Design an enzyme around this catalytic site. Structure first.
Site, PDB file in Angstrom:
ATOM      1  N   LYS A  21       0.817   3.725  -2.350  1.00 62.52           N
ATOM      2  CA  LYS A  21       0.319   4.968  -2.735  1.00 62.52           C
ATOM      3  C   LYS A  21       1.044   5.799  -3.374  1.00 62.52           C
ATOM      4  O   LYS A  21       1.440   6.930  -3.330  1.00 62.52           O
ATOM      5  CB  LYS A  21      -0.437   5.852  -1.616  1.00 62.52           C
ATOM      6  CG  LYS A  21      -1.307   4.954  -0.676  1.00 62.52           C
ATOM      7  CD  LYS A  21      -1.960   5.845   0.180  1.00 62.52           C
ATOM      8  CE  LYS A  21      -3.517   4.932   0.760  1.00 62.52           C
ATOM      9  NZ  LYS A  21      -3.041   3.943   1.846  1.00 62.52           N
ATOM     10  N   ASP A  81       3.363  10.577  -7.350  1.00 60.63           N
ATOM     11  CA  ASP A  81       4.571  11.554  -8.115  1.00 60.63           C
ATOM     12  C   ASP A  81       4.602  11.246  -9.585  1.00 60.63           C
ATOM     13  O   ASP A  81       3.600  10.589 -10.081  1.00 60.63           O
ATOM     14  CB  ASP A  81       5.782  11.211  -7.465  1.00 60.63           C
ATOM     15  CG  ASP A  81       6.775  12.268  -7.098  1.00 60.63           C
ATOM     16  OD1 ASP A  81       6.860  13.474  -8.023  1.00 60.63           O
ATOM     17  OD2 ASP A  81       7.555  12.249  -6.089  1.00 60.63           O
ATOM     18  N   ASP A  99       0.788  -1.423  -0.020  1.00 61.41           N
ATOM     19  CA  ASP A  99       0.050   0.056  -0.072  1.00 61.41           C
ATOM     20  C   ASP A  99       0.978   1.082   0.152  1.00 61.41           C
ATOM     21  O   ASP A  99       0.999   2.010   1.050  1.00 61.41           O
ATOM     22  CB  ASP A  99      -0.767  -0.160   1.389  1.00 61.41           C
ATOM     23  CG  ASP A  99      -1.947   1.073   1.129  1.00 61.41           C
ATOM     24  OD1 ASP A  99      -2.023   1.826   0.291  1.00 61.41           O
ATOM     25  OD2 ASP A  99      -2.711   1.070   2.349  1.00 61.41           O
TER      26      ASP A  99
HETATM   27  O1  LIG Z   1       4.464  18.273  -8.826  1.00 58.99           O
HETATM   28  C1  LIG Z   1       5.471  17.711  -8.935  1.00 58.99           C
HETATM   29  C2  LIG Z   1       5.957  17.354  -7.482  1.00 58.99           C
HETATM   30  C3  LIG Z   1       7.267  16.957  -7.256  1.00 58.99           C
HETATM   31  N1  LIG Z   1       8.030  16.663  -8.184  1.00 58.99           N
HETATM   32  C4  LIG Z   1       9.567  16.275  -7.927  1.00 58.99           C
HETATM   33  O2  LIG Z   1      10.566  17.225  -8.305  1.00 58.99           O
HETATM   34  C5  LIG Z   1      11.473  16.662  -9.139  1.00 58.99           C
HETATM   35  C6  LIG Z   1      11.452  17.182 -10.596  1.00 58.99           C
HETATM   36  O3  LIG Z   1      12.678  17.061 -11.228  1.00 58.99           O
HETATM   37  P1  LIG Z   1      13.292  17.376 -12.591  1.00 58.99           P
HETATM   38  O4  LIG Z   1      12.046  17.054 -13.823  1.00 58.99           O
HETATM   39  O5  LIG Z   1      13.537  18.673 -12.576  1.00 58.99           O
HETATM   40  O6  LIG Z   1      14.326  16.169 -12.912  1.00 58.99           O
HETATM   41  C7  LIG Z   1      11.293  15.182  -8.961  1.00 58.99           C
HETATM   42  O7  LIG Z   1      12.075  14.535  -7.739  1.00 58.99           O
HETATM   43  C8  LIG Z   1       9.838  14.987  -8.821  1.00 58.99           C
HETATM   44  O8  LIG Z   1       9.385  13.983  -7.951  1.00 58.99           O
HETATM   45  C9  LIG Z   1       7.732  17.290  -9.593  1.00 58.99           C
HETATM   46  O9  LIG Z   1       8.322  17.004 -10.580  1.00 58.99           O
HETATM   47  N2  LIG Z   1       6.407  17.861  -9.606  1.00 58.99           N
HETATM   48  O1  LIG Z   2      -8.658   5.041   1.831  1.00 58.50           O
HETATM   49  C1  LIG Z   2      -7.985   4.767   2.482  1.00 58.50           C
HETATM   50  C2  LIG Z   2      -6.735   4.125   1.921  1.00 58.50           C
HETATM   51  C3  LIG Z   2      -6.215   3.266   2.531  1.00 58.50           C
HETATM   52  N1  LIG Z   2      -6.103   2.996   3.906  1.00 58.50           N
HETATM   53  C4  LIG Z   2      -5.147   1.971   4.713  1.00 58.50           C
HETATM   54  O2  LIG Z   2      -6.004   0.695   5.322  1.00 58.50           O
HETATM   55  C5  LIG Z   2      -5.742   0.556   6.263  1.00 58.50           C
HETATM   56  C6  LIG Z   2      -6.932   0.834   7.273  1.00 58.50           C
HETATM   57  O3  LIG Z   2      -6.444   0.319   8.620  1.00 58.50           O
HETATM   58  P1  LIG Z   2      -7.569   0.105   9.708  1.00 58.50           P
HETATM   59  O4  LIG Z   2      -8.126   1.787  10.098  1.00 58.50           O
HETATM   60  O5  LIG Z   2      -8.392  -0.844   9.616  1.00 58.50           O
HETATM   61  O6  LIG Z   2      -6.743  -0.136  11.137  1.00 58.50           O
HETATM   62  C7  LIG Z   2      -4.475   1.300   6.747  1.00 58.50           C
HETATM   63  O7  LIG Z   2      -3.405   0.633   6.485  1.00 58.50           O
HETATM   64  C8  LIG Z   2      -4.741   2.532   5.872  1.00 58.50           C
HETATM   65  O8  LIG Z   2      -3.429   2.849   5.644  1.00 58.50           O
HETATM   66  C9  LIG Z   2      -7.400   3.475   4.593  1.00 58.50           C
HETATM   67  O9  LIG Z   2      -7.660   3.226   5.886  1.00 58.50           O
HETATM   68  N2  LIG Z   2      -8.269   4.355   3.818  1.00 58.50           N
END
Ligand SMILES: O=c1ccn([C@@H]2O[C@H](COP(=O)(O)O)[C@@H](O)[C@H]2O)c(=O)[nH]1
Ligand SMILES: O=c1ccn([C@@H]2O[C@H](COP(=O)(O)O)[C@@H](O)[C@H]2O)c(=O)[nH]1
Lengths: 258, 258
Positions: free
Chosen positions: A93, A96, A91
């Site tokens: 998520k 980026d 999980d």
């Molecule tokens: O909206 C976003 C948020 C974060 N980054 C982060 O900023 C850096 C952009 O790198 P570059 O495209 O300048 O190499 C990466 O580490 C990327 O994960 C983005 O590019 N856009």
């Molecule tokens: O929308 C979401 C997405 C993911 N989780 C994940 O599911 C688990 C819920 O655990 P509990 O609240 O049942 O202990 C956690 O690991 C949490 O990160 C949620 O609870 N809600």
């Protein structure tokens, strides 16, 4: 649409092999329970996986909370997944740009793609997030779940956000196998719906989590799989709790099948 | 309304200590450049931080892409941060329910809160994401950035989503010091704006990244800090490239100051 069984859907034409593998073991074992193994010790993770393995279709991890993670721990988890027949869902998520998430999936210390059957992604960055994960996941026969809704109060994953999530799934059905959602968001039976925020008692926690019963989520709202953490983990006997949740989620699924 | 200098902003009554420390060093060193140190080896991370420390106000990490992460590496990074005077920003993008993100921030192998001055969070889960992080960040005197907009094609972080981000930041000003955004999104000068997706030349990458120039982002769109990765890292001469970006961002800031 009319209600298909997990077994019928496993056999479908457009179905990802991962989803098919999942749907078969669900049918075989009579379980649509995903254990959310939110523990910080490998020994506890592994003892839960082994003990509860027969009761679950899937074990969901947060590897970044494991104080003593190593890839050997993940090796032993894989062995338990093969032995007891369940999938491993990390999980993570991913949320980026594509160029970043591909490295976060393949590399680093976790090397998530090497051991996780499934991962999930937030859709907020646009479809680049899925494209980056795909480059790594496709050859490995992995699957991905898109977060179309969340269980928490104040969730912004609503309305057009949710609809964008479903479109994105449809556009990448070679790799995306379904949704993290509070209810059914797509009628396409090849898509899985997994729902967190589940306890026997509807309610919540102190930081915005909301709970609904298995009957509500599976029965009324038409989701496929319940994700349960604290409702099981906090119990004295986690096996008994797992069995309670399994029968509840399963009997709820049988009910809507008719 | 009337633009205040970074030095004056650092002294505002409601300024957060971490934001104040950053604004001070930006004015002192004449840099509003954040290096995105997207590398897979500790040695490369430490090398870049040392070589380019003088040119930057901030180093942004993705520690989950480091093949050989250890906490000793982070200890060393902090020595560099203290010697050259820059903050450490771990671009973790927390995006889970409050109960989960607090463990992800404090715990696991990375122990992010033990070394990152700043982290960021997606707003999609609702404010429970910030409330969870705060439990960990406030004792450790840390700050947080909310992702109000994204640089990538198809980003859903628009309109009301963006406004929800700004509200959430205003309501957690003890912990939230600003935004990841493509432009100014709050009129409150206590908030910082950091903008990724920046390069001198027009374009993007093959996975949805889009680039705008420092003069566009700082000068016309009123953001504070540019985040630059490949624009520096892929150049033959990274010291020269870092200096070009610093001078571009800084002069753009001066122009807007009049
Ligand atoms: O909206 C976003 C948020 C974060 N980054 C982060 O900023 C850096 C952009 O790198 P570059 O495209 O300048 O190499 C990466 O580490 C990327 O994960 C983005 O590019 N856009
Ligand atoms: O929308 C979401 C997405 C993911 N989780 C994940 O599911 C688990 C819920 O655990 P509990 O609240 O049942 O202990 C956690 O690991 C949490 O990160 C949620 O609870 N809600």
């Amino acid at each position: 649409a009319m209600e298909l069984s997990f077994g019928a859907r496993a056999e479908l034409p457009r179905i990802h092999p991962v989803a098919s593998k999942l749907l078969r073991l669900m049918q075989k074992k009579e379980t649509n329970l995903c254990l959310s193994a939110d523990v910080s010790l490998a020994r506890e993770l592994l003892q839960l996986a082994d003990a509860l393995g027969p009761s679950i279709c899937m074990l969901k991890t947060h590897v970044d909370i494991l104080n003593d993670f190593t890839l050997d721990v993940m090796k032993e988890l894989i062995t338990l997944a093969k032995c007891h027949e369940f999938l491993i869902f990390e999980d993570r998520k991913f949320a980026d740009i594509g160029n970043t998430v591909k490295k976060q999936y393949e590399g680093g210390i976790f090397k998530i793609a090497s051991w996780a059957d499934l991962v999930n992604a937030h859709v907020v960055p646009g479809s680049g997030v899925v494209k980056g994960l795909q480059e790594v996941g496709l050859p490995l026969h992995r699957g991905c779940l898109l977060i179309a809704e969340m269980s928490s109060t104040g969730s912004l994953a609503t309305g057009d956000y949710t609809r964008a999530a479903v479109r994105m799934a449809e556009e990448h059905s070679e790799f995306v196998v379904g949704f993290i959602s509070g209810s059914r968001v797509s009628m396409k039976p090849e898509f899985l719906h997994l729902t967190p925020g589940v306890q026997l008692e509807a309610g919540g926690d102190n930081l915005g989590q909301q709970y609904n019963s298995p009957q509500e989520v599976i029965g009324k709202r038409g989701s496929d799989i319940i994700i349960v953490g604290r409702g099981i983990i906090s119990a004295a006997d986690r096996l008994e709790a797992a069995e309670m949740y399994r029968k509840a989620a399963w009997e709820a699924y049988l009910s809507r099948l008719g």
